[PDB]
Design a protein around this ligand. Structure first.
Ligand code: APC
Lengths: 1119, 95
DNA sequence: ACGCCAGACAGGG
RNA sequence: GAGUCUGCGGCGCGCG
DNA sequence: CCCTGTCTGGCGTTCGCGCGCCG
């Protein structure tokens, strides 16, 4: 097969490592790979020095000085797979050097203290917390600076806002309400904006004349003259304004906290925050944030500039000071690292908390080791973040692509500190700057929306969470192959142009060519074109860039497309699309699906389990292949060798294919011939058909592995033993259970068979007087033990592939308490494409299989080749996605021209070029037909008649020439197959790429007769093997209520759900074929009544005449 | 749809009354013995694994088939509440 | 965060 | 002449 | 003491289902 790529825009740089944001972040986060000597001291090391120098001086005896030397972590407790087999947490051990000083002669250094086991990152980008691989999703929020936004309700004047992160650390606001007051709020209650200026050193005279020479708001600042006449005293007066009831005397203590070290930020001195300063407001910053502690007299080059631009924003045009939040030059993205470092520093504070208490507890000098350190805080802190933080979820690995996307989708919700869920219409929208930084489509449909959205193609987090987007430089009318990842703020300063601009190389080609100043479409001249976009891909995300003609599909319907991919299930037969975008390769490779060759060499051994290659450097490595592993979602992950024995391999060539790769190509679903016409009723508006022939060759088949597990608990009634002994009825059910207790490998287990046998005790504490007579009659000597064996739950099972058993003397496993021993039973099963399933193309047409028609009578082409699937036309008019109809046309060509193609995003193939390829396919189609010996059908001509009368073929031309014309249109004549008659009117057909969507347990249906019930409420509930009842909701109630469905409504509220005595009698009755008794009171009411009785209220039922009646049959009366 | 549902609907003063009648009829059909019917002979209710519906498939399916005929009588207070169940057990055998 | 309803208290004759 | 005990609150994501 | 107005205080905000995790 051949590959022709149409769109020509010089892709200047490759797409960044999709995983680059997670990998690198965690790299800089934990600099452990390089000695402490290496300078990058952010994250771990930074947080360490941030809280390591613990200074505790006087309250009794002090002069405590504990300081950090070097942090080193290195030998993993166990390995990856070992941590998945055994429920373990893959974490490296960390213990840095520590030495505590004394005010007396002596400094004891207790070198290591293994406090905290921190998780590690896998080579791909995911973790292993407990048994399952997890993902740390990034997040967004406002960065730290000072801005001036318009007043809430009053249309009047705007107010200032100083934002200092960490959380602890004031949040200032400057608002003037002139009838007599001004308002500057730290935690809440206003004082002046001047009471603070005066403390630092700004007098009413100098302040007013310099900040207010241009404005009049200065009259609210000189207002309260009475407090403004005393300097250093206003320092103590402000302290008074805070409210606990604290000592008036505290030299420069709390003025320090909102001064130099903690609350304000240790974000790199210079570009972290000072950036948002110099450009947006105020000119200088002395010391990272408003910081100083040299003379006791503080300096604030930030507090006057915020109100200076408030006075400036509210008066005129010093510039236009209205900040569009959403401009990405403002809201920052929190990488994994940052999120772990924060919790790490939260744990450090918790440790430093308790250590300070021990500086006083320790008798004398020997207090370095255990006297100062307790691993309790750190452990729980970190652990809590990776196991219970609302941000870590199941890696979506339907197909590696799925996981990669799940990893780059941008979120708002998080710590809880940043943004909550019922607040955000301005956040949710896709801002301008989200360009090449956040997908505008990856936003999942559903309640949680807009808050989550994967990043774009070339998008890459620079140094500080500013998704910079690539933009190439263009000096004069000359465009460069040079690129600048730019901050979202900086982007507005320039006039940038699109990539579609005609270019001769470095030369712009049209005088009036498109460019966008600042979120505004602008027709610029080649002379003003300062920068140009890098490529159409950057605009969107990875998951989206996999869409063929995304240009012809409606943004909303495309979303579904991108989402659908994330739900693609791995088929044994993986086939790349007949029409691709260009990133299928990049996907599987940046993802770790396929196994690539490191260096060039030759192949030595090609096993089904390993391919030992021999590199030409004189080295040979054994590459194991993950045979069959259990994905978190239960999909199969096998690496299928694709290289034969003894083969010279190129550097970076696939040796084995990933779970869903055909040949180094991403593959989820297969390319099938498809006729786009309506059948009886099978393909409904959204519903679609399928050819039995597709099942014949395993075209739509996938593998699913499940991990059933059971434990031998320790009851005070007697240990639960695991043995081949299943106490009560047959040997026929004990065959598969070959090994004493365990099930034999390679055994076909159907629903209801014994996977594992276990024996517990019959009652709670007492035997049974009735069961005692039954046992004795036929044979008293009966193993008193009850049958509590793991059985195949309804639904299905397959063949037992693997079994795991952990007995008494555990190797290095963590057996829970009470748990004597566990027994895992992996069962696999082949799933063949059936009616219930759902499939969908990359564009948006989604649909379920309605009927598996036999090849016998489905639509077939003049030549015996029959169609695979029949898609309903109606589903494409109302819905706007002609890209699909465009994919089927080029596909048609590829079928008879035996070749694949690559149509870029907006630059790809064009209608003329396709008609061309189609012209080439006609000869292969009809040319072979001419030579093979035959011409045109009565049928083929009949359809032409109706076709000329339609307006598809120029009347007066030969059938040979007409059919060509008609073929170019993308449609060919087809016979019914059931009658052999043709289909009056040409019907398009082609090679359309369709994928199979993941069959969740929501697919595998649920039908419940009788089963469990809830403890407190007496409503039906299931879970494991008993389905669980459906909800009847008031809306449905109303439905029956509308109807005269009295009893039907009663039944639902009584006999079927809550009437404890009712259901029981109900059942028996039906068993008997009797007429169901009359409903007793529903437990829900009873539980209501009492719940209400819990509260003062007394609710009593009454008779004809206001007199009692009893709901509680008789347990309410006392004694 | 169902046999002469409109014919049936016209036979009663209110929709929901027909429903109560059929139901109460199906109830007695089973309780006093399933042979408590008024039109079994020539053309009657039937199923096909054999023609066995003649004995006990669906109760109301009969009730409707009978009410469609002009044999039964439904009123607000036709026969005294308790004396009916007594005479009914006295004349109808199956248990 | 918002929107809405209902409310209890304070200001201007 | 079989019936106990477990699955809760919350979080995340996905369907229509 | 009255009527009017203003901030204030309480509640609500689809529906059902999957899966997986956690104390
Ligand atoms: N947030 C939401 N809440 C409730 N129901 C939702 C929903 N999103 C989707 N649905 C439901 O599931 C259906 C999915 O939408 P569609 O199938 O597009 C219906 P439609 O109105 O027929 O559009 P269509 O004509 O394009 O098919 C809707 O009828 C709606 O009932």
């Amino acid at each position: 097969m051949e590959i022709k790529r149409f769109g020509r825009i010089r892709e200047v740089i490759p797409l960044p490592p999709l995983t680059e944001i997670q990998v690198e972040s965690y790299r800089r986060a934990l600099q452990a790979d390089v000695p402490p000597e290496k300078r990058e001291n952010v994250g771990i090391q930074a947080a360490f020095r941030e809280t390591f120098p613990i200074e505790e001086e006087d309250k009794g005896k002090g002069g405590l000085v504990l300081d950090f030397l070097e942090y080193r972590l290195g030998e993993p407790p166990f390995p990856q797979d070992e941590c998945r087999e055994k429920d373990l947490t893959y974490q490296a051990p960390l213990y840095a050097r520590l030495q505590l000083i004394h005010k007396d002669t002596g400094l004891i250094k207790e070198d290591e203290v293994f406090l905290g086991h921190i998780p590690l990152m896998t080579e791909d980008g995911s973790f292993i917390i407990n048994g399952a691989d997890r993902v740390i999703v990034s997040q967004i929020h406002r960065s730290p600076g000072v801005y001036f936004t318009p007043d809430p309700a009053r249309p009047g004047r705007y107010i200032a806002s100083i934002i200092p992160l960490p959380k602890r650390g004031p949040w200032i606001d400057l608002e003037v309400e002139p009838n007599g007051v001004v308002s500057m709020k730290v935690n809440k209650r206003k004082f002046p904006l001047v009471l603070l200026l005066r403390v630092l050193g700004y007098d009413q005279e100098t302040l007013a004349r310099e900040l207010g020479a241009y404005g009049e708001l200065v009259q609210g600042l000189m207002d309260e003259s009475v407090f403004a006449m005393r300097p250093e005293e206003a320092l103590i007066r402000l302290f008074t304004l805070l409210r606990p009831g604290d000592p008036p005397k505290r030299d420069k203590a709390v003025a320090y906290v909102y001064g130099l070290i903690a609350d304000p930020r240790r974000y790199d001195l210079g570009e972290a925050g000072r950036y948002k300063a110099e450009e947006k407001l105020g000119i200088r910053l002395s010391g990272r944030t408003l910081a100083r502690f040299e003379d006791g007299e503080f300096k604030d080059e930030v507090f006057l500039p915020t109100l200076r631009y408030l006075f400036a924003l509210t008066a005129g045009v010093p510039g236009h000071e209205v900040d569009d939040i959403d401009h990405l030059g403002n809201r920052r993205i929190r990488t994994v690292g940052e999120l772990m470092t924060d919790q790490f520093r939260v744990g450090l504070a918790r440790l430093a908390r308790g250590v300070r208490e021990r500086m006083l507890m320790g008798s004398e000098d020997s207090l370095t080791p255990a006297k100062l350190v307790n691993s309790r805080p750190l452990e729980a802190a970190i652990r809590e973040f990776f196991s219970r933080s609302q941000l870590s979820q199941f890696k979506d690995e339907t197909n590696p692509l799925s996981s990669l996307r799940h990893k780059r989708r941008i979120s708002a919700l998080g710590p809880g500190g940043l943004t909550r869920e019922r607040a955000g219409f301005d956040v949710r929208d896709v801002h301008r700057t989200h360009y090449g930084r956040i997908c505008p489509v990856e936003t999942p449909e559903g309640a949680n929306i807009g808050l989550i959205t994967s990043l774009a193609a070339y998008a890459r987090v620079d140094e500080l969470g500013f998704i910079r987007t690539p933009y190439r430089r263009v000096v004069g009318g000359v465009v460069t192959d040079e690129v600048v990842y730019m901050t979202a703020t900086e982007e507005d300063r320039y006039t940038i142009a699109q990539a579609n601009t005609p270019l001769e190389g470095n030369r712009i080609a049209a005088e009036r060519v498109v460019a966008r100043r600042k979120g505004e479409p602008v027709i610029v001249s080649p002379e003003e074109v300062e920068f140009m976009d890098v490529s159409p891909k950057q605009v969107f995300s990875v998951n989206t860039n996999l869409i063929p003609f995304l240009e012809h599909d409606d943004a909303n319907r495309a979303l579904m497309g991108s989402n659908m991919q994330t739900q693609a299930v791995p088929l044994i037969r993986a086939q790349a699309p007949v029409v691709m975008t260009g990133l299928e390769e990049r996907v599987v490779r940046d993802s770790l699906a396929a196994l690539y060759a490191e260096e060039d060499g030759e192949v030595a051994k090609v096993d089904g389990n390993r391919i030992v290659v021999r590199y030409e450097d004189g080295r040979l490595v054994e590459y194991p292949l993950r045979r069959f592993y259990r994905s978190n979602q239960g999909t199969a992950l096998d690496q299928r060798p694709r290289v034969v024995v003894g083969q010279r391999v190129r550097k970076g060539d696939l040796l084995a294919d990933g779970p869903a790769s055909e040949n180094g190509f991403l593959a989820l679903g297969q390319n099938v011939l498809v006729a786009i016409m309506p059948f009886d009723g099978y393909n409904f508006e959204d519903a679609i058909v399928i050819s039995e022939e597709l099942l014949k060759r395993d075209f739509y088949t996938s593998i699913h592995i499940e991990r059933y597990e059971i434990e031998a608990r320790d009851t005070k009634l007697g240990p639960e033993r695991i043995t081949r002994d299943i106490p009560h009825l047959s040997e026929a059910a004990l065959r598969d259970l070959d090994e004493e207790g365990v099930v034999r490998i390679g055994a076909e287990v159907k629903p209801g068979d014994i996977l594992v046998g276990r024996t517990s005790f019959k009652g709670e504490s007492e035997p049974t007087p009735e069961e005692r007579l039954l046992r004795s009659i036929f044979g008293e000597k009966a193993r008193d033990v009850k049958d509590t064996s793991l059985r195949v739950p309804p639904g299905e099972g397959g063949i037992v592939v693997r079994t795991v058993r952990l007995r008494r003397g555990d190797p290095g496993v963590e057996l829970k308490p009470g748990v004597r021993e566990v027994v895992r039973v992996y069962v696999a099963q082949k799933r063949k494409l059936q009616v219930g399933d759902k499939l969908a193309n990359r564009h948006g047409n989604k649909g379920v299989v309605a009927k598996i028609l036999p090849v016998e009578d489905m639509p077939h082409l003049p030549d015996g080749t029959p169609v695979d699937v029949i898609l309903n036309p109606l589903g494409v008019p109302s819905r706007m996605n002609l890209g699909q109809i465009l994919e089927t046309h080029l596909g048609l060509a590829g079928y008879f021209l035996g070749q694949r193609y690559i149509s870029p995003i907006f630059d790809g193939a064009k209608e003329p070029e396709i008609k061309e390829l189609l012209a080439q396919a006609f000869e292969v189609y009809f040319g072979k037909r001419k030579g093979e010996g035959f011409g045109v059908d009565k049928r083929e001509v009949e359809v032409l008649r109706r076709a000329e009368k339609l307006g598809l073929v120029t009347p007066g031309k030969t059938p040979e020439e007409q059919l060509k014309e008609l073929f170019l249109q993308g449609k060919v004549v087809l016979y019914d197959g059931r009658t052999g008659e043709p289909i009056e009117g040409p019907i398009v057909v082609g090679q359309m790429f369709i994928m199979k969507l993941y069959h969740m347990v929501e697919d595998k249906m649920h039908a419940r007769s009788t089963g469990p019930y809830s403890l407190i409420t007496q409503q039906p509930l299931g879970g494991k093997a008993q389905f669980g009842g459906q909800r009847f909701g008031e809306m449905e109630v109303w439905a029956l209520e509308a109807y005269g469905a009295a009893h039907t409504l009663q039944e639902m509220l009584t006999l079927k759900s809550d009437d404890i005595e009712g259901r029981n009698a109900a059942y028996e009755a039906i068993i008997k074929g009797e007429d169901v008794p009359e409903p007793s009171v529903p437990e829900s009411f009873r539980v209501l009544v009492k719940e209400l009785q819990a509260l003062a209220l007394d609710v009593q039922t009454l008779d004809e005449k206001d007199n009692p009646v009893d709901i509680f049959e008789g347990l309410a009366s006392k004694r | 749809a169902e046999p002469g549902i409109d014919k049936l609907f016209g036979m009663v003063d209110s929709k929901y009354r027909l429903t109560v009648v059929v139901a109460k009829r199906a109830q007695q059909l089973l309780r006093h013995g399933f042979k408590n019917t008024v039109l079994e002979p020539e053309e009657r209710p039937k199923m096909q694994t054999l023609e066995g519906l003649f004995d006990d498939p669906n109760a109301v399916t009969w009730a409707m088939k009978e009410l469609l005929t002009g044999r039964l009588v439904f009123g607000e207070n036709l026969v005294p509440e308790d004396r009916l169940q007594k005479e009914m057990e006295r004349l109808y055998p199956v248990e």
